C-alpha cells in the first residue's frame, strides 16, 4: 500500500419510478316516458322511447 495502489473509491446508483392511473365516470339524471315495443316469452317488456326538445338554435 505504499502508493495509492490499494486506494479505492467508487459510487453507484440506480433509481426507477413508474406510475399509472385511469378514471371513468358518468352520470344521468333525467326522466323519460317510453313505450312498449314487444312482449317477450317470459313477460319482460321491450321498451323504446324518444323525446326531442328544440330550445332554440338546435
Amino acid at each position: 500500500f505504499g502508493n495509492s495502489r490499494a486506494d479505492m473509491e467508487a459510487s453507484g446508483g440506480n433509481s426507477f419510478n413508474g406510475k399509472g392511473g385511469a378514471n371513468a365516470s358518468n352520470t344521468f339524471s333525467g326522466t323519460l316516458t317510453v313505450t312498449v315495443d314487444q312482449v317477450l316469452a317470459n313477460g319482460n317488456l321491450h321498451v323504446v322511447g324518444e323525446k326531442q326538445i328544440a330550445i332554440n338554435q338546435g
Binding site: 502508493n3 495509492s4 495502489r5 490499494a6 486506494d7 479505492m8 473509491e9 467508487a10 459510487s11 453507484g12 446508483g13 440506480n14 433509481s15 426507477f16 419510478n17 413508474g18 406510475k19 399509472g20 392511473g21 385511469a22 378514471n23 371513468a24 365516470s25 358518468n26 352520470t27 344521468f28 339524471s29 333525467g30 326522466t31 326538445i53
Partner: protein
C-alpha cells in the same frame, strides 16, 4: 251535444276535441369524465473517481 257525461269522474279528455293541460317541468342532466396517466422515470450512475493499481486494467 247528446253525449253521456259522468258526474264523479275527473273530467279527463276523451274525444278528439278535448283539451288537456301539460306542465313541462323537464330537467335532464348528463355528465361524462375520463382520465389516464402513465409516468416512468429512471436514472442510473456509476463512477470510481479513484481506481486501485490492481484494478486500473478494467
Amino acid at each position: 251535444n247528446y253525449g253521456y257525461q259522468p258526474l264523479f269522474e275527473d273530467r279527463r279528455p276523451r274525444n278528439i276535441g278535448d283539451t288537456l293541460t301539460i306542465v313541462l317541468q323537464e330537467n335532464v342532466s348528463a355528465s361524462k369524465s375520463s382520465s389516464a396517466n402513465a409516468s416512468r422515470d429512471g436514472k442510473t450512475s456509476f463512477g470510481f473517481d479513484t481506481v486501485p493499481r490492481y484494478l486500473q486494467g478494467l
